[PDB]
């Protein structure tokens, strides 16, 4: 999904 | 009701457009309204 690792999403 | 459509969902992955992102682009195409107006009747709740 969108935005790897760094975000909770 | 006539559902006229193209019977495939095309998925195109784009590693070329954005570099760290794959950006899956999926699409399918479809359409329709009523072809025979007599073939559907409705219920109405006013009076």
From TrEMBL, chain A:
Subcellular location: Virion
Domain of life: Bacteria
Protein name per its UniProtKB record: Phage major capsid protein, HK97 family
Range within the parent protein: 101 to 109 of 398
């Amino acid at each position: 999904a969108l935005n790897s690792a760094v975000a909770a999403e | 009701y006539t559902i006229a459509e193209r019977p495939d969902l095309r998925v195109l992955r784009d590693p070329f457009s954005a570099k760290p992102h794959v950006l899956f682009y999926a699409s399918k195409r479809v359409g329709g309204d009523v072809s025979d107006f007599a073939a559907i009747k409705l219920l109405k709740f006013a009076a």
